[PDB]
């Protein structure tokens, strides 16, 4: 009853207990203990759910603290603004560290281990996602480079996806969903956003109608598309 095996079981107890930081740790043990083989679909999804929950809690706090700093800076209340920004820096710091940890793991182990179109697009989309979270709060030269790394990763993901995966594939559909959110929200370019989202939705519709979760993601492209045409 192996180390890999027991770490995966612990990661799943951590997921039930909602101790996501521990879940991340157990899955990195798994991931750093692999030779030439890659993570199973189950293991990869466990690592991804762990990081997503560790980063989402901080993104949720960052939005809250940021909406407050803006209301308060708008009433010209300077002492509260310093207190709020200092709180926000603390949070941005945890966001940089969390991203740094999954981005290093992607470049060092995951991406080099990706042997099929499914896993390649999965890890490249992930790489695009964490550089994008860095861009949501960064501001200058830092924002420009996070935005550039984002665009580069999504494009590499889309090249593979477009040619090796079905348009109804959830990973390809999720890539299109996140890539178009990037155009809309980081690049403030609503037109490239709508175009990319609609093309992916249509191609999926086309395939479903001729060749036969992909359902949930498509509802999400539609929800974003209408949200944006407003």
């Amino acid at each position: 009853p192996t180390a890999r095996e027991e770490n995966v079981y612990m990661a799943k107890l951590a997921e039930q207990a909602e101790r996501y930081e521990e879940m991340v740790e157990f899955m990195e043990k798994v991931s750093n203990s692999l030779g030439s083989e890659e993570l199973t679909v189950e293991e990869r999804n466990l690592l991804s759910v762990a990081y997503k929950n560790v980063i989402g809690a901080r993104r949720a706090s960052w939005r809250i603290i940021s909406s407050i700093e803006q209301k308060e800076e708008s009433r010209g209340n300077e002492e509260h603004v310093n207190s709020i920004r200092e709180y926000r820096s603390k949070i941005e710091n945890e966001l940089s560290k969390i991203c740094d940890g999954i981005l290093k793991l992607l470049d060092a182990k995951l991406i080099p281990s990706a042997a099929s179109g499914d896993s390649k697009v999965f890890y490249l989309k992930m790489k695009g996602d964490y550089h994008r979270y860095l861009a949501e709060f960064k501001t200058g030269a830092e924002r420009k480079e996070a935005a550039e790394s984002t665009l580069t990763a999504y494009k590499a993901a889309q090249d593979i996806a477009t040619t090796e995966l079905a348009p109804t594939h959830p990973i390809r559909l999720g890539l299109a969903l996140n890539f178009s959110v990037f155009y809309y929200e980081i690049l403030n370019s609503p037109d490239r956003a709508c175009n990319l989202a609609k093309q992916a939705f249509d191609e999926a519709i086309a395939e479903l109608d001729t060749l036969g979760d992909s359902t949930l993601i498509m509802q999400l492209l539609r929800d974003n598309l209408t949200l944006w045409t407003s």
């Binding site: 939005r63 969903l177 959110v181 929200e185 993601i217 929800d223 974003n224």
Partner: peptide, 5 residues
Amino acid sequence: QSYTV
């Protein structure tokens, strides 16, 4: 904020 997965 838009939906992502």
